[PDB]
C-alpha cells in the first residue's frame, strides 16, 4: 500500500545494488537488448516502428533515475540524451535514422576524413552561430547535415540548410572583449517566457542582466567574463574554474520576467 511512484524508488535500489549477473540485472537486461535490437533494426530498414515498447520503457526508467541508466548501460543513455536534445527542437527521430545509416556505411578511416571535412566546412562560415558551436549543438547539427546529405545527394545544400536551421532557432551571446566575440550558444526555444516564441527576446534581456549582474558581484574571475551553456532544460552561466555555477530554466526565467513586469506600473 505504497505510492505507485515509490515502488520504483526501491526496485531500482535493488537493481543498483546488484551484481552483474544477478537475476535483477538479468531481467532488465532483456529490456536493454530488445531496445538495442530495435534501434539497430531502425537504422537498417529506415523506419522507426510505431510499436517500440522496449525503448520507451527504458526511457521512462531513465527519466526516473538518470544516474542509474547512464551508469549501467552507457549507450542507451547517450541515445536518449540525443533524442532529448532533438525533441527540444522539433526534429523528428527520423533525422537520426537518416544520419546513422550514412555513418554506419563508412570505414573507420572515412569517418575521420568526413569529420575533419565537416569541422573545416563549419569553421569557414561567417556567422558565429555556426563557426563557433558547442559540442552538443555540433552533434545535433551534424545530424541535420547528414540527414540532408543522405536524402538529397547535395553535399552543399546540407550546409546551407543546417546553417539556416541554426540561425533561425539559436542565438549567440557575447560580452566584453573576448577572442571570437562569442560566449556560449543557447537556442531561442529555451529562452521564452510565454507561449509565443517571439517572447524569447524578452527572456534574452534577463540573461544579459543576469550575466552582468554576476560579473558585478563576482569580479575575482580570471577575466571579468563567464561562459554560457544550455544542457537539457537549463542555462549554465558557469565560471572558468567552475565555482560560480548559476542555473536558470524556463520556469525561473518566466518567474523573473513576471516579477519584472510587476515593476513597470510602479
Amino acid at each position: 500500500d505504497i505510492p505507485d511512484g515509490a515502488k520504483d524508488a526501491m526496485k531500482l535500489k535493488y537493481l543498483q545494488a546488484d551484481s552483474k549477473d544477478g537475476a535483477f540485472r538479468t531481467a532488465i537486461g532483456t529490456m536493454v537488448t530488445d531496445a538495442g535490437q530495435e534501434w539497430s533494426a531502425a537504422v537498417i530498414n529506415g523506419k522507426l516502428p510505431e510499436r517500440t515498447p522496449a525503448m520507451d520503457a527504458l526511457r521512462r526508467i531513465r527519466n526516473a533515475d538518470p544516474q542509474l541508466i547512464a551508469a549501467l548501460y552507457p549507450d542507451q543513455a547517450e541515445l536518449f540524451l540525443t533524442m532529448d536534445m532533438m525533441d527540444k527542437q522539433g526534429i523528428d527521430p527520423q533525422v537520426i535514422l537518416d544520419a546513422d545509416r550514412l555513418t554506419v556505411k563508412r570505414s573507420k578511416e572515412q569517418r575521420f576524413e568526413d569529420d575533419k571535412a565537416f569541422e573545416s566546412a563549419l569553421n569557414a562560415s561567417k556567422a558565429p552561430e555556426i563557426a563557433r558551436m558547442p559540442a552538443s549543438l555540433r552533434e545535433s547539427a551534424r545530424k541535420i547535415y547528414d540527414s540532408v546529405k543522405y536524402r538529397s545527394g547535395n553535399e552543399s545544400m546540407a550546409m546551407e540548410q543546417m546553417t539556416k536551421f541554426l540561425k533561425e532557432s539559436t542565438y549567440t551571446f557575447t560580452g566584453d572583449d573576448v577572442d571570437g566575440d562569442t560566449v556560449g550558444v543557447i537556442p531561442k526555444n529555451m529562452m521564452q517566457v510565454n507561449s509565443d516564441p517571439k517572447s524569447w527576446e524578452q527572456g534574452r534581456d534577463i540573461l544579459e542582466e543576469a550575466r552582468k549582474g554576476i560579473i558585478a558581484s563576482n569580479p575575482w574571475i580570471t577575466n571579468k567574463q563567464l561562459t554560457m551553456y544550455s544542457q537539457g532544460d537549463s542555462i549554465y552561466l558557469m565560471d572558468t574554474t567552475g565555482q560560480v555555477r548559476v542555473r536558470y530554466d524556463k520556469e525561473l526565467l518566466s518567474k523573473v520576467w513576471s516579477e519584472n513586469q510587476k515593476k513597470l506600473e510602479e
Partner: protein
C-alpha cells in the same frame, strides 16, 4: 475406492448412452479403465470406430449393448467380452465361463469381473463372488478390496512457481515540441523571414 454419489460429466452423459444397456454398468466400465471408454488398443479404435466423450461413451454403449444382448441375461459375460474380445483369446474363456470353470478363464477377466459384479447382475454372480474363498464356504477377495489402502501419495504438486516482470514506470517524456519556425508560424501567421523584412 469408488461410489455412485459423486456426479460429473460421466454421469451426465451415460444417462442417455444407456438409453441408446445400463447406466450403472456403463458408469463403472469406464471408471475402471479411465478414472472419471479408454479404447487403448489401436485395433479397437479401427474396429469400434477417439478421445471425445461424444462417441467414446457412445462406442462402449453400442458394444456393451450387443454384448449384454448376445445372451440377454448374462451381464457379467458382457463385461468379460468387452475387455476380452471374441477372437483367438476370449473364445477359450467364454466357453469356460458358462460351465463355471473360473479357474480357467484368465488372470485379467476374473479381476475385471470381480470389480464390476457389485453393480452388475448375472446368474453366475453369486457363483463367482465365492469362486476362490479360503474355505469352500468362503468368499475370494478381489484385487482392489484386499489391496485397498495400500498406496503412496505423490509428493509433486501441479502448483507452479511464479516469476514477475521488472515493471517499473517512471515519468513519461514530453512530446517533440514544435520547431521554432513552425512555432512562430501558427502563432504569428507569418514565417521568420517575413518577420525580419520589416
Amino acid at each position: 475406492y469408488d461410489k455412485n454419489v459423486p456426479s460429473d460429466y460421466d454421469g451426465l452423459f451415460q444417462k442417455a448412452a444407456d438409453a441408446n444397456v445400463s447406466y450403472d454398468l456403463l458408469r463403472k466400465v469406464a471408471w475402471t479403465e479411465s478414472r472419471f471408454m479408454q479404447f487403448t488398443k489401436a485395433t479397437a479404435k479401427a474396429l469400434g470406430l477417439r478421445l471425445n466423450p461424444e462417441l467414446a461413451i457412445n462406442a462402449a454403449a453400442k458394444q456393451l449393448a450387443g454384448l449384454v444382448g448376445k445372451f440377454d441375461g448374462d451381464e457379467l459375460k458382457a463385461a468379460l467380452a468387452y475387455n476380452q474380445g471374441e477372437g483367438r483369446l476370449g473364445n477359450p474363456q467364454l466357453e469356460a465361463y458358462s460351465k463355471g470353470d473360473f479357474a480357467s478363464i484368465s488372470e485379467e477377466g476374473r479381476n475385471y469381473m470381480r470389480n464390476l459384479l457389485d453393480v452388475a447382475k448375472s446368474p453366475m454372480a453369486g457363483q463367482l463372488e465365492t469362486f476362490g474363498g479360503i474355505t469352500p464356504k468362503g468368499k475370494g477377495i478381489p484385487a482392489e478390496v484386499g489391496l485397498a489402502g495400500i498406496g503412496h501419495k505423490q509428493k509433486v504438486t501441479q502448483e507452479l512457481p511464479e516469476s514477475t516482470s521488472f515493471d517499473v514506470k517512471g515519468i513519461e517524456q514530453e512530446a517533440t515540441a514544435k520547431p521554432f519556425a513552425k512555432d512562430f508560424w501558427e502563432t504569428h501567421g507569418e514565417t521568420l523571414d517575413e518577420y525580419n523584412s520589416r
